[PDB]
């Protein structure tokens, strides 16, 4: 099995730097991109950048150019992220995730750090929450500011569930495809600019925050999330 095992929580002061690690196992480290994602309370999920440990080439969200530095050590199969000039804005949980042919299907457990673009695709989720009773079905909407349809015929829209106290998990990839290990109570549809996650027969394990995300073009972007809770 793929494993991504991140370093421990950090309690740090403003104006300092921190460097965190993401130890990979269970696959060929130098074959796949590793992405990094920031989870800051009230700010959903935010994509920082990615690195290919084979080439060492990194790509950054412009918002993090001069904040975050991604590196990799092929001897220890470890990816690193260093943050400089720490501020309260940097207090967050940070995840590494393996990119499997555009699917962020494997996630680290996160590292908590406590500090004591106009052309970017905007992903919107109109409902902050959905409140349901077990056994009900539910629909969750998302919209993208431009078509997510690629020349290859795929639509690069993804749905994730982040259960309480857990890392995000991939549910639906390329608009409609069901991810491995996910029950077929989950399904996805869309028009290329508007999308719907449908969940039949909701159960307690479905509680958490649902995010849409685009992986069409850098920087990758997430919707604001829709929290599902039981009445």
């Amino acid at each position: 099995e793929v494993q991504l095992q991140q370093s421990g929580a950090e309690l740090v002061r403003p104006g300092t730097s921190v460097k965190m690690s993401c130890k990979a196992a269970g696959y060929t480290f130098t074959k796949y991109w590793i992405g990094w994602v920031k989870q800051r309370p009230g700010h959903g999920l935010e994509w920082i950048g990615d690195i290919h440990p084979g080439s060492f080439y990194s790509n950054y969200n412009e918002k993090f150019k001069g904040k975050a530095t991604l590196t990799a050590d092929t001897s220890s199969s470890t990816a690193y992220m260093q943050l400089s000039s720490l501020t309260s804005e940097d207090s967050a949980i940070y995840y590494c995730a393996r990119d499997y042919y555009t699917n962020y299907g494997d996630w680290g457990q996160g590292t908590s750090v406590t500090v004591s673009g106009g052309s970017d695709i905007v992903m919107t989720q109109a409902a902050p929450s959905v409140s349901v009773t077990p056994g009900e079905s539910v629909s969750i909407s998302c919209r993208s500011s431009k078509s997510l349809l690629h020349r290859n015929g795929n639509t690069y829209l993804f749905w994730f569930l982040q259960r309480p106290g857990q890392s995000p998990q991939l549910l639906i990839y390329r608009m409609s495809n069901l991810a491995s290990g996910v029950p077929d109570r989950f399904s996805g549809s869309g028009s290329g600019t508007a999308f719907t996650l449908r969940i039949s027969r909701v159960e307690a394990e479905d509680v958490g925050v649902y995010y849409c995300m685009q992986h069409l073009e850098y920087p990758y972007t997430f919707g604001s999330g829709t929290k599902l809770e039981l009445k």
Partner: peptide
């Protein structure tokens, strides 16, 4: 898999 972008 492209070595310089993860974009499809």
């Amino acid at each position: 898999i492209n070595y310089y972008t993860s974009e499809p």
